[PDB]
Amino acid sequence: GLATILAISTATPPNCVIQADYPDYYFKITNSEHMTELKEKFRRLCEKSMIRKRHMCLTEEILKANPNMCLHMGTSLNARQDISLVEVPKLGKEAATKAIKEWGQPKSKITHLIFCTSAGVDMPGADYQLTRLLGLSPEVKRMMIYQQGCYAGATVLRLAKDLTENNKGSRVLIVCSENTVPTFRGPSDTHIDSLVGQALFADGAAALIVGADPDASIERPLYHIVSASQTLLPDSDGAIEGHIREAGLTVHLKKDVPAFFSANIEKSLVDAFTPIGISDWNSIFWIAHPGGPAILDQVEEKLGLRKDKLKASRHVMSEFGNMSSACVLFILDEMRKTCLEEGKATTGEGLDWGVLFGFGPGLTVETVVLRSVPIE
Amino acid sequence: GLATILAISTATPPNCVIQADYPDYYFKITNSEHMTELKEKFRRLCEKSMIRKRHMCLTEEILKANPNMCLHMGTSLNARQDISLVEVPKLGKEAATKAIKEWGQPKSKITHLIFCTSAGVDMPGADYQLTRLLGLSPEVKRMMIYQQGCYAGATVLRLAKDLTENNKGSRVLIVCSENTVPTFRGPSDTHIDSLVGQALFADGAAALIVGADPDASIERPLYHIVSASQTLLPDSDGAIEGHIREAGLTVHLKKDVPAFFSANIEKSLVDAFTPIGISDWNSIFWIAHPGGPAILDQVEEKLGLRKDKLKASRHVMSEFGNMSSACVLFILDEMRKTCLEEGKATTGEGLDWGVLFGFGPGLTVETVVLRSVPIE
């Protein structure tokens, strides 16, 4: 009885920004059009991002009401909190409602809730807000995963596996909800790494139902969570940092983040798949947190992946940008929907075994081994 | 094979404040001595707190260097973060080293780390900092429980139970580390509830080793974690709130918080103990988060507990104050040490079954059922 994903749904705020137009908009809304060379640098970041569009509850109108958010380091945490702390459970509820509808069982059967966001902290947390918004049972067992950044979409699966497998009959609702409200800020020609965030980060929420021992008469498995690991990369201290400050969430990068991930990723593959007898990385299906396009390019190069292995991952990046923890969950939804639509033999692009990677601060790699489910 | 507590240790910062002297010190350091009636109110809060002393890394010297922290609502989150983000894993390391020493096994056998704090958020988190400070394996499986307030000492036991029981051979290190750096602030005669926090909150860290299937030749069980539940109290929305703002962590209370907990606590007892055939609440040993003295008084009254049932809980409150998540772990250490010293028959004051309560925002009650271990 492995933890099994039984439903997936997603949600995004209606407001959408076209990446091709973002450099003009961003340098206008931040009053930085005189920064002609930095605008060109940002234009190249956006072109290289391989993102077509991003959803953002931050509208021009809200930014106009919050000018300190358009500065690079304007005092603005309170304004960011006021917006984000409402948005996070609101967007998460939209995804959760759809996931519960697909699942088809009463919400009273939800025994556990995992909520995950890096978009703003509060007491009680977004898990409490979502519980009240959805009308979950007051006895729902909640785990609130705050501020773990971009690997946390795999973290919640690692958590959900132990929760559901140790508690017979349990059904876990997972909700990840992320947005750019804490990180949006104006440009600085001494903080280029902050510009990278302005080119990549986006809003989105994903919700899943997870449970061991599915009842085949009422539930439909999509993926089985076989194993889940976490590791810190050698000599990587300080590569990615995010600080929660009076100016909001500031982001700090070293140059060769992609090099660390690509140089170390095969060790996670070896540890996870050699015990199963698997060594051909093109023979498994892939879900890779795509928030750094260079990371996927370099992993693909390093391992010699066929250019289609990362297609669903890069697809979600193109249509949605870096939604932090939400991305890998969006990608799972994309994969199982595409495989059903195309008559593939399994929810894992016709393959039996799969890998799901989360990447983020540490540097941390989360490695989840999945089994697909046959499609008949 | 139940999750079993195998070692407990604690740590506090050296700087200690005597409660009898705190009202004079507090109104002097905050330049509020003209607030004679509010000082009398605060003096009564401190006298009624039943706290003798509290440990605090916040010294007079640090406060003198950070005058905005002595205002009621001075911009000061950055200053608070700069202090707290270093202190939290530092104090947690002191407790973890001692717990690992008591446990007696190599740190390479630690497979999971749970870190818990409400004293400040950062990316990577305090779990990462502690892992590097202690030299844990880079593959240690980490869970970072941020900002869950005062019930989170039971939350980490609920988490640790599922982690260790679902992973054969696993050994979990739990560290809770809390301090007053985010919440210390000057008085306001329109924010009386903030004064309550100034009378109660304290610094402390606790660390445990938890594992299922102890090896009796090298390990010594103290408590078994039988069950763990969480529930939200009816009609309690908004009773306790904490907001992370430009002025730090602000705390907001309604009047009858103790009434909600005492009125609802027996339902948690019934749900947890009736299935085991237990109904006499004086026949189990008690660990109760003591951070609200009125809560313990009213629970004792409501249930008719003999006046000694809460002795270890009130003892930790007297000697250490409200250390948030750390308290219930300090209390477990106190109980097992006292029972060994006094020749009691079990680590649970001679009784076989016990209850551990966490109380906090929601309103949330965490209910952990424990079994004691015989003492021979």
Residue B288, judged by CB atoms within 10 A of its CB (0-12, 13-18, 19+), counts as: buried
Distance from CA of A202 to the nearest CA of B (A): 18
- The CA distance from A58 to A64, in Å, is 10
The residue extents of the domains of chain B are: 1-221, 222-375
- From the list A146, A165, A237, the residue facing B146 with the nearest CB is A146
Resolution in angstroms comes to 1.9
Measure CA of the first residue to CA of the last residue in chain A; give whole Å: 22
Q: Which residues of A touch B147 (CB under 8 A)?
A: 121-123, 125, 144, 146
Q: Which residues of A touch B77 (CB under 8 A)?
A: 77, 244-246
Is A38 annotated among the ligand-binding residues? no
Strands A240-245 and A223-232: what pairing? unpaired
Q: Which residues of B touch A166 (CB under 8 A)?
A: 161-162, 165-166
DSSP class of residue B233 equals: P
Q: Which of B46, B70, B116, B150 is catalytic?
A: B150
Q: How many CA atoms lie within 13 A of B278 on its CB side?
A: 20
Is A93 annotated among the ligand-binding residues? no
- The CA distance from A233 to B141, in Å, is 13
Q: Which of A46, A57, A116, A150 is catalytic?
A: A150
Q: Does residue A176 have an active-site annotation?
A: no
Q: Which residues of B touch A244 (CB under 8 A)?
A: 77, 81, 121-123, 244
Contact between chains at B123 and A121 (C-beta distance less than 8 A): no
Nearest CA in chain B to A268: B139
Query: Which of B123, B132, B364 is the best mutation test for A, with the most CBs of A within 10 A?
Result: B123
Contacts of B362 (CB under 8 A, 6+ apart): A124, A128, B151, B232, B233, B236, B240
Query: Which of B69, B162, B268 is the best mutation test for A, with the most CBs of A within 10 A?
Result: B162
- From the list B123, B167, B245, the residue facing A149 with the nearest CB is B123
Bridge partners (DSSP) listed for residue B251: B242
Contact between chains at B141 and A121 (C-beta distance less than 8 A): no
CA angle B124, B127, B128 (to 5 degrees): 50
Give me the count of residues in chain B.
Answer: 376
Contact between chains at A123 and B241 (C-beta distance less than 8 A): yes
Distances B336 to B215, B316, B320, B353 between C-alpha atoms, Å: 20, 13, 18, 14
Nearest CA in chain B to A164: B162
Contacts of A229 (CB under 8 A, 6+ apart): A158, A268, A271, A272, A366, A367, A368, B139, B141
Three-state SS sequence of chain A? CCCEEEEEEEECCCCEEEHHHHHHHHHHHCCCCCCHHHHHHHHHHHHHCCCCEEECCCCHHHHHHCHHHCCCCCCCHHHHHHHHHHHHHHHHHHHHHHHHHHHCCCHHHCCEEEEEECCCCEECCHHHHHHHHHCCCCCCEEEEEECCHHHHHHHHHHHHHHHHHHCCCCCEEEEEEECCCCCCCCCCCCCHHHHHHHHHECCEEEEEEEECCCCCCCCCCCEEEEEEEEEECCCCCCCEEEEEECCEEEEEECCCHHHHHHHHHHHHHHHHHHHHCCCCCCCCEEEECCCCHHHHHHHHHHHCCCCCCCHHHHHHHHHHCECCCHHHHHHHHHHHHHHHHCCCCECCCCCCEEEEEEEECCCEEEEEEEEECECC
Contact between chains at B148 and A159 (C-beta distance less than 8 A): no
Bridge partners (DSSP) listed for residue A368: A228, A356
